[PDB]
Structures are given as structure tokens and as C-alpha cells.
């Protein structure tokens, strides 16, 4: 056999360090213990191992948050920023996020406009399961709107209009006669108070003094309603400058920050950019489906953010490459939900 | 019934024939050929004259842009301005080939910064710690020295001072669109997309203008000279009006996110765009708007039911200059 | 008409209820719930008794595996055997819950090597030059020291000698399936998938068995002891026969490539599989077979027209142990 | 303004080295020069820059191949391995590959079974354009098979059967009476000789003594035909061991190797594993759409192959993340097709 060939393939190797963890999956001959099954993801490899690392990172930021020490929310030992794209509020992850907000487990929310309005609309009418392959022409003819494999009847938006128009009237009157300078976070707090329904994420956020930022709040159905309303009752102004001040000072005056970001886009960048103002987040977990090759911010690995100063150089950020509708409930089950006693 | 056949290089390298053969090559090459046809259709419609009835309806805008037979919305993600696609977009704006621009904050600031300092080529693998120690920021396989932002601060802070003054003394109600026009006028540089946009009366929408370096500067400036207000409501009125009073609309959308949905949503106000070409790398399986196929937008009324939208699944830095070569650039004489 | 609703953690951490709620959560969580239902349907059908007529048709195989009411084909890519999913697959084979296995060469050799030396956790970012200098091979975020392959060579070379002898002296016509059964018998280790496969008469198909370390060893051995023949024609006959004489078939396919097409093509011989669950990360846009949706296979007759196939778009290292927990592992008592 | 904040965002930077290339796209004010347009991809960024690097890598392997110096193919100064997945032969890239083989510009082909049979079937009947969204039930009812957005009538396979069965008879007879030990490469050479049509990739490959490897040749329509034929005329054996010997010795005895791989799977690994036998390829270009996160070989970056010894440590491998149906014709236009004079 050719000597160079044998030397290439049968190269000698170095011994790995003794802390080296061996690959091994869960053994179902033990039966089905769901806690042991989830723990075994950490030694299974590929994204299962990243999930295991994400559990560890989240548990670290919770433990730090539970250490004793233009906002009335009290400082804790670690401020947790939670960001999520709109479509995740269309999904049942809405319930997962509501739970975290209800029990004051996170401190700052960031979402796009759909992620605001659809939480409110779900208190008036439900969203239904469908399929991705349904054809647009047939859905349009029957007054049904598709979001992935979910379906929202047009009627839902008519109900939202009827609910929202009197509130927009009051907001204009308060602006003009009580001096209120409206921003997205202030409007979202008001809407959560008005929906007055404990299934709503934003009801709990305003009850618990958790601010919600959404700088492009007009890009959605709420924007449509504001548009039509402005010809009936002109005058509403929505400033985004004050809200930049508010989010950035949440980071600047924190003892510690952690970021948990579901998806990409504005929600990811806006949280990360706030944490640059303190020379970076202490903890960071990304769960998203985007890839780096197209140079996008959405698809950028956590290590790109280290180069900017958005994540501290000493941090151990983790990305899980998966649909958050699969992963986030499992993550919550092994982290926040295990510490519910401590949060109350 | 068209047969699959690729370009035969025994014919020699005849570039125009090679590009034409994408249409019969299959997979995304065929979608590229269909995108060329759709964009040439937008352009042909744009060049048709307005009848007397049509010239009445459209004219209801008080837009000082001349009105045409097809309003073209161009949307692009911040990173594409970091790329050399900035030059591709500047060309289209310089020659009035598009009517409305939508981009995120990075897509505005990095055009201006490129007039002050250049962006450099690097690699995706470069480690963050080493780059941070040297003040080098990474954008994919591109590199922006932090000094670039230091020069931006020196140039912008005086303009922010004037804007606050004009607001408090002349009653100016600032919006992202108005600010972008002002910054384009101030850069006074023919390499800038926003210089040409303001010169040609092409409006630029960016509802989350605070999400980037421009935000950092406004934040810092707020401490020395407070009061700047940026209203997003008036800009919603403006973008929606551009679609409502159009005879025909076309959408050319590079990437996903806010830029894609905001253009599509404006076109829902007229019961849908007539033409639509998407070029993005996102996939539908996660339920995202970014990854949604054009047919999802048909269910909402954002694209007309009888339109023939096309999506090309590819990095726009490869596809978009070839698309422009085969469409707008072939009709340059018409736009002058 | 089912309403979207996620699991409510105010109920506490009730794992079975949490997994059940994926079905109404949306996007790929819902596809996971539909995959659970489809696999439970395969299992229910498998446990139904054969009638007298049915027990005649099926029995035409000379397979010594007992025949059941649903033949389940399990396919998986090499990398999943490098992962801890190896343990998941071993469980199913050990308890006779699947009937036919299809994997690539890596999926065979790495199971055997794991009985000699372990694979370790690492990270995708590790640089190749540094790893090569230390004789460490990278498989994604996993690490295999080259010494692992040195031990494999010592263990396999004597078996290759016997196989060539049996071919030349006893007329044995070797095929990938026959070789894999032999290697499983030789490893004699209850942690190995192929030890259990040979013990339970579960055939293993791998038409490109030469594409990996097993190939390297056969190549080197060929110089000292020439003549080994591995016929792939007989194995084609064998896999196709398993589908033709089945009362019902189901396909569970982890990943893409040869493993996906070869199972689907065997099922075309019976005018399509009755049940089908795909779990892979590939996308359709490039025209690949890996990325093709199940509905593409319906056009060929590889999946029956009235089947309800499901694809879950996810890394199988996350999804497959949860799927097994909610399906096969709940019926363990039936398979003993 | 907070001092730490200003220090975080307005950090001082180091000067880049003077060889640093500036980002700039093609300027259409120059008009439309397609050669200048393609050259400008190298300074455009993201995958356009990777395309520019791929042009350079391919031109380097061609230049080395053109230097003066169980196979009758003569050694050149650099052996070029070309691999491609089956679906690319269904596409019009079939013509691109044919051109390279026709003019002896590459030395070794590797493809899966579909990439063999569909080149032959296209000489009997064409493939047609369709759409990805066409429904399987309606296509099946009309006897049409879908490949991505392409369509192949069932009739095509009936024509292939009629053409192929007499050839399989002769192969069995030659095995049994002339001692021929059939392998995939030998069968593919014979099929290319029999199709006798200069539109066929494999006609040119056998005319020019370019071997074709396909170790899972049974996974396709050719396998179906071999299966049905074996009950009418039993006996055919197809050995894969001899073909492993043949591909690996192409690498071992090369002066220099380059790999150009379109897609992933068996085709990618099999070429790379052959080049491990010489301690790695000198040049490597990957064009594929797969991603690394799932631990797949398909999605692995070139740097993973450096760790195995499949790519030399001193090499400068490139991956372009794109559909090869877009990129490969452009790549060929700027590399092989510019040097056609030298190849004749
Ligand atoms: N429900 C809707 O989708 C909806 C409704 C109203 C308005 N809009 C508007 O559309 C715009 C764009 O939406 P966006 O900014 O929220 O993001 P997006 O949904 O458009 O996608 C951003 C990126 O997030 C990642 N991502 C998305 N969903 C994911 C998931 N389930 N798991 C993992 N990663 C995931 C993907 O990589 C995607 O490319 C917003 O301004 C929003 O207000 C959308
Ligand atoms: N240079 C920067 O990326 C930069 C700079 C400053 C601020 N930001 C902020 O980041 C936020 C998110 O950025 P964004 O919304 O502009 O987009 P993004 O980077 O989040 O991209 C959104 C989606 O567009 C698609 N896309 C991106 N690049 C593409 C390409 N090359 N070809 C095809 N499709 C492509 C991808 O599917 C991606 O998931 C914005 O608010 C923005 O201001 C980014
Ligand atoms: N460990 C190894 O990867 C290894 C070892 C030796 C030889 N090889 C050889 O490499 C060749 C190619 O490998 P292959 O065909 O087994 O597959 P592959 O690695 O080429 O994967 C094929 C496709 O399957 C899907 N897939 C992969 N991993 C997945 C996951 N974790 N979850 C979901 N989907 C996933 C992806 O879409 C991928 O593109 C084979 O001939 C094989 O023997 C590989
Ligand atoms: N035409 C067909 O698709 C066809 C026909 C007959 C049989 N088969 C059989 O199916 C099996 C699997 O096919 P395969 O191994 O060729 O690969 P594949 O098409 O199944 O995919 C392998 C990977 O290659 C990459 N890829 C595929 N097409 C690409 C493209 N256009 N551009 C860039 N990257 C691309 C993707 O990352 C994909 O995951 C083979 O054994 C083959 O014989 C398929």
C-alpha cells in the first residue's frame, strides 16, 4: 500500500484534556424520565448540545438576578432583556412569554408591531391552525389571512378596529389637553391596561412595570388603524426619540444584563445596541433560524457582536439554530419554571 | 412547454446570451429569468404615458415628484448599503428609475459614512475579541474601523443642533423621511444615495431610524441639547399615500424584515401591488414574514391576485447587479 | 378548526402535557405534533395481526425476520451516528421496533469505532490547521482523535482476511448488507446498533459503503490480499423485495441524500409508502432531492396519494429523542 | 452624556494594513461591460466576494494544469476533480458540464446515479420547466414527475427502458463469457459509448478517457431497470471495490489536485476522501447551499476538511453559498472558457 497514503490516513493523535466530555445520547432502556432526557441533549451533539449550553447560560443569568442588592421599576442584580419577532406572538409562544411577564421574570421587552397587536387581538378572537401550502387566491376570496401555517380571519381585524378607535380618541385628547407626549412604550402600556385581560402579555407588562419597546410600531395593523383614525381625528404624534433614551438607560444603569433573543431583525439589533452603551451584555442566548452567509444582522453569529462591544469579550454567548416554537418552551421548562418559587 | 437547456459555451462567451439562458436552466436560474421579465414589465408600464383621466386621479398627491404610469418601491436591508450594492442603488436613484425607497437605519447612516471613510473587505471567521481590541467592527465579511463613527459624530452633531433649533424656532415637525432628505442635502456628495434621493424628490422611509449609529448620536446629543422629536405617524400617512394615488405599483424588495412588510403593507391600501420581485435568503418554515413566499402576501391583499410575483432565493449581492444590467441599465436612455 | 394556544406554565412543569401542546403551538411545533401522530399510526398498524390471506402474500419473502402488519424503514445520515442519536437508534433496533435500516458508510463504521474509542464534544469554530497538527478530526462540533481509526484498522484487517478467504474458498458473494451483518456479529457489543441488527435479522443497506474509513481500510487491504468484491445489485433486489411483499410500509427518514432517496425508491416499487415522516434541514429552492417536500415524492408514486406525510424542518439531534419518547417508548411493553 | 457609554461607542481604532481593499460595487454610469461587472463582484462583499475568490482559485488550478510536465489517461500538471449532484444534470448545468468534458478541461467526474441516467435520457426526450408549487396528486394522475421546478414525463423512462435493456443483455453476456468484472465507472463508459450523441456528457467522457465514479449507481432509475432486468436475465454483478481503487489512485499519483464540487453528499465526500490519500488537495472550490449547524458533511465548511487532511493546510479553499444553477455558468465564463485556446 502506498506509504504516503497510509501516513496521511493513519496519522498519530494527541490525547485530549481529561475534562473532555464524551458524546452519548439518552438511553431509553432507562424508561422515559423527561428531565433526564432533556439533560442528555448537552452530550448529544450539534444543536442539542447548543440547547444544553443555552440552559446553562439562562440558569446563570437567573441566579445572578436572584442575588440580593425615568423608570419606577426596581433594580435587581441582573436586568434581562427578552426580544421576539411578531410571528411568535401569532404562535402559541405567546403563552410562554405571557408566563414570564406575569411573574416578573424578565425586565424589558422588545418586539415588532405585529407582536404587540396580535396579543391584543387574541383576547378578542382566536387564531387557527392551517398549512403553509394553502393558496393565497382561495384564502383571499374567503376572507382569511395566512401567517405561516396559521390562519387569521379578516373579522379579527374588524373587532380590533371597533375596540381600538375610542382609545385612539382618548390618546389624542390627552395629548392636546394634558400634555402627554406619546411614544411606542407608553402606547403599549396604555393598550395593555385597556385590554384588561390576564391572557394578554401586555396587560401583565403594564401591571408589573415592564417596559415594551417597538420603534417601528406603525408597521402593522395598529399602523393601519392609526392611519384611518387620523383622517377622522387628526393630531396624534408618536415619538421614537424618548423611547431610545428609555431603553438605553435600562442598560446603562444595570448591574448586569442578559439578553434572550428569539428571532432576528430590529428586535435583535435594538437590544444588542442598547447593551453596547455599557460595553456589552454579560449573558446572551440567541434562538434563530437565520444564517451568516448573506452578511445580515439577523444571521450574524454572537461573535460578530463581540467585535462591536455588544457582548462582553469575557461572555460565553450561545446560539441555537432552530425554530423557537420548538425550543423556547423546553428552555423555559428547564430554567425559569424551575425557579418559580424564588420569583414570587 | 419550454425545454430545459443551458448556455452552450462552444458558442464563445457571449454574455447577453449567457444571461438570457438562465431562464431555461432551471431552479433559481429560472426564477432570475422570470424576475428580469417582471422588472422589464414594471419599466415598460412606467414609461407609458398617462391619459387625461389617469393624470387627474394621480396628481391628488401633493408630491413634487412627477407622476408616472407605475410607482416603483425599492426596499433594501442595512447590510446591502454596507456592501457594494450601495453603488447599484445610487445609480437607480440618480437616474430617477425608482420612486420610493425603504431601508433600515444602517442603510441610511452607512451611505453617509462611506462619503467620509471607506469600508474594507475581511472574512466571516475573524474573531471578535481580537477585532474589538483593535477597534475594528465586523459586518459579515466586511470591516468598519471605529474611527469611521468618530468622523460621523463630528459631521452630524452640528446638524442635530440646527434641527432642534428649527423645530423650536420655525415649528418644523421632524420625521425620519424629512431627516433623511436633510442629511442627503448636507452630505452634498454625488456618491451618496440620499444626496440623489433629495435632489430627485424620492422619499425615503425608515420607521425605526433610531436602531443604529444615528440613534447613538441622537441619544448622546439629547443630553446637551434636548427636545428632538421624530414622529413616525406622519411618515405612515406619506408612504400609504404614494400607493393609494398610484396608477400602478411595483415592488422590488431586497431582503426581509421591516423593509419588506412596510412596502407590502402600503400596497395593501390599494388592494395590492401589480408587480412584485423578492430577492432574499429567508425560508418559510419558521413562520416569519421575512421567509414568507409571495403567495402568503396574496392572501392578505398585499399583492394583487392576478399578479405574477417572483422570488429569487439568493444573496442579493450576487443577483441584484445582474438584474439591473438586464433591465434598468438597458433603458438608461429613456430615463435621461 | 383548532385554535392556537401554547402550554401554560402556571400549570407547573408537566412534561407530557408540555409535549402534547406542541401540536397547537404553530410552525414546526405543530409539524412535530403531526409527526408524533403519524408515527403512532405506523406503530398501531404494525401491531395489528395479519389475517390468513395477508399472512400468505407476505411470507413470499424468504426473510427470517417475522413479518408484521407494517414494515418500517428507518434512514439516517452518517453524522447522526457520530452524535448521541446513535443511542436512540440502537434502542429501536434492540427492541425490534424497526424492520429495515439505511445509512451511509459513516453511519456504519462510527458505531463500531464507538465500541473501541469515544467521540468528544468540541465546537464548530475550531481551526483545521491546529486540529490537524494534533491529529484531531472535526465532525461539526464533535471531535474524533485519529487514534480511533488506528484501533479500527487493527480490529478490522483480520476480518477482511477471513471475508476474502470465505469468498475464494466457500463461494460467499459479499454485499454491503452481508458485510454489515458480519461486522455487527464481530463487534459482539450490546452498545452497537449493528450487533442488535444482525441479532434481530434487521437488514442494513448502504450502497456506497466505500465512502469513508471502511473504504480506506478495504483499499489498503486490497494491496496485501486482493480480490474482495462488494456487489450492490443483489442488495437492490433485497431492499426492493422488503417493500413489494409488505402489507403496509412506513418511512422515518432523518436527513437527506442517498438514504432518503433509496428508501423512497424502494417504496415506489409498491406504488408508495402508506406513512412517511421526514426530519431534515434541507430546503427545496435548489432543486435537490434532500430538500424536496414530501409532496414532490407523491408526484413520483414514492408516497401514496392518500397518505398524510409530514416534514419537520429541524436538526434531528433535537427532535428525534422527543419523537421517540412520545411514540415507540410509550409502547415498549408491546415490543417485548 | 454618560462617560462609559461614550467610551464604549466612540472607541479608538487601529489603522488597517495598506494592502486593504475597499468595498465598492460596479458603477453603471460606465454603461454595461459584463466582464467589468463580473470582476466587480470581488469588491462587492458577502457571497459576491466569495465568487470573486472562487474565480481566482479556479484560474490558479487551470494555470498549474497548463504547465508542461490502471488508467490510459495522461498525467497533466494538475488533476481536476469535478463533482455534481444529480439534480444539476436535470437542470441546464448539464450543458455547462458537457462543455468542460468535451474539451478535456477536467480529469475525473463524480456524480450520483441520477446525474448519470438523466444525461442519457435527455438524448431521448426532453425535460420541461414547471414550478415548485405544483401538487403531487395532480401530476401523478397525468403521468408527470417533478424535480424541483422541472417536469419529466413518465414516457421518458419508458423510452430509456427500451434503449437500455439490450445493452444490459450484452453486459451480462460479456461478464459470463469474456470475463468482464463490471463496476460503475466501466458501465458508465459503456453507456456513454452506446448513446453515441455529442450532446451527452458521458459520450464525451468515454471519448476523452475521463473516468466517472458513482458508487451508489443503483439509487435511481438505472437501478430500477437493473432490478427488473435481473429477473429476465439474471447474473449481473456491479462491484464497487475496484472503483475505490481507481479513484484513489487518480489522487495518489497526481502532481497536483484541484476539486470543484457542486452540491454535497456522496459526491463531495468521495472526492475529498480520495484527496486525503495524498495528504490533501492543493485547490478547492465548493458551491453549495447547505449549512454547517446540523453537523452534516454536506454543510461542513472547507476548514473542517483541513482538520482531516482532505485539503492541504497551505491551501486557500473557497465556498460560495448559492444555487449552482446561478453561479456555475458565470464561474465557467470567467475561467475555463477564457482559456479555451490553450485546451485545444
Ligand atoms: N405576524 C407577522 O408576521 C406580522 C404581522 C404584522 C406585521 N408584521 C411586521 O413585519 C415586520 C417583519 O417582522 P419581524 O421583524 O418580526 O421579523 P420576521 O418574522 O420578518 O423575521 C426576522 C428573522 O427572524 C428569524 N425568525 C423568525 N421567526 C423565527 C422563529 N419562529 N424561530 C426562529 N427564528 C425566527 C428569521 O431568521 C427571520 O429571517 C415587522 O415590522 C412586523 O411588525 C408581521
Ligand atoms: N449594517 C447592518 O447590518 C446594520 C447597521 C446598523 C444597524 N442595523 C440594524 O439592524 C436591524 C436589522 O437589520 P435589517 O432589518 O436591515 O436586516 P437583517 O440584517 O435583519 O436581514 C433581514 C433578512 O433579510 C434577508 N437578507 C439580508 N441580507 C440579504 C442579502 N444579502 N441577500 C438576500 N437577502 C438578505 C435575510 O433573510 C435576513 O434574515 C435594523 O433595524 C438595522 O438598522 C444593522
Ligand atoms: N460522519 C460523517 O459525516 C461521515 C463520515 C464518513 C463518511 N461520510 C460520508 O459522507 C457522505 C455524505 O454524508 P451523508 O449522506 O450521510 O449526509 P450529509 O452529511 O451529506 O447530509 C445530507 C443532508 O441531510 C441533512 N441532515 C444532515 N444532518 C442532519 C441533522 N442533524 N438533522 C436533520 N437533517 C440533517 C441535511 O439537509 C444535509 O444536507 C456519505 O457517503 C458518508 O459515508 C460522512
Ligand atoms: N434528479 C434527482 O434529484 C434524482 C434522480 C434520481 C435519483 N436521485 C438520487 O437521489 C440521491 C440524493 O441526491 P444527491 O446525492 O445528488 O444530492 P441531493 O440533491 O439529494 O442534495 C445534496 C445536497 O447538495 C446541495 N445541493 C443540491 N443541489 C444544489 C444546487 N443546485 N446548488 C447548490 N447546492 C446544491 C444541497 O445542500 C443538498 O442538501 C442520489 O443517490 C441520487 O442518485 C435523485
Residue numbers in the entry:
A (entry chain B), D (entry chain B): 9 to 77, 89 to 363
B (entry chain A), C (entry chain A): 28 to 363
Sentences reproduced from the published study:
Hypusination is a unique post-translational modification of the eukaryotic translation factor 5A (eIF5A) that is essential for overcoming ribosome stalling at polyproline sequence stretches. The initial step of hypusination, the formation of deoxyhypusine, is catalyzed by deoxyhypusine synthase (DHS), however, the molecular details of the DHS-mediated reaction remained elusive. DHS catalyzes the transfer of the 4-aminobutyl moiety from SPD to the modifiable lysine (Lys50) of eIF5A in a NAD-dependent manner. Recently, patient-derived variants of DHS and eIF5A have been linked to rare neurodevelopmental disorders.
